């Protein structure tokens, strides 16, 4: 599971490769964040597209509780 | 940003994929399955990058040492 044949890893593997070649002594100190940002809100549009908007199914399938998922969509500004 | 196509449209085929091999199957943690795909690569290419420098990684990521620590057990890469 998640795969786009090749798994999702890897593809996140080249990205930061590519990000990496850009930096050419430029600091960078929210990687993590960056990183994240990138991946939770895709993961949330989905879900929420998936549950058509149904906040307690969304949760239950992300194994999240539903004030965590409301915290995550506040924080994207996806409402 | 993060590009490989930004990394997130991958991200968005991967869960499309994911969720057509779904069938009336039941998913509980696809918060962790996302993630843990995701951050292994992240703390594989950071340590690279700095070398196995663990406090130069962690200031990169933009966390402490100790989280960075957690998370290399987590995967079983410390």
Same mark, same amino acid.
């Given at each position: 599971?998640?795969?786009? *044949?090749?798994?999702?890893? /890897?593809?996140?593997?080249?990205?930061?490769?590519? $990000?990496?070649? *850009? %930096?050419?002594? *430029? /600091?960078?100190? /929210? %990687? $993590?964040?960056? =990183?994240?940002?990138? =991946?939770?809100?895709?993961?949330? /549009? #989905? =879900?929420?597209? $998936?549950?058509?908007?149904? *906040?307690?199914? !969304? !949760?239950?399938? #992300?194994?999240?509780?539903? &004030?965590?998922?409301? @915290? @995550?969509?506040? @924080?994207? &500004?996806?409402?």
């Amino acid at each position: 599971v998640l795969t786009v *044949q090749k798994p999702l890893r /890897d593809s996140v593997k080249q990205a930061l490769k590519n $990000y990496f070649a *850009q %930096l050419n002594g *430029q /600091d960078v100190n /929210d %990687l $993590y964040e960056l =990183v994240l940002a990138e =991946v939770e809100q895709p993961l949330l /549009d #989905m =879900v929420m597209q $998936y549950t058509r908007g149904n *906040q307690t199914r !969304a !949760a239950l399938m #992300m194994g999240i509780n539903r &004030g965590t998922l409301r @915290k @995550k969509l506040k @924080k994207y &500004g996806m409402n």
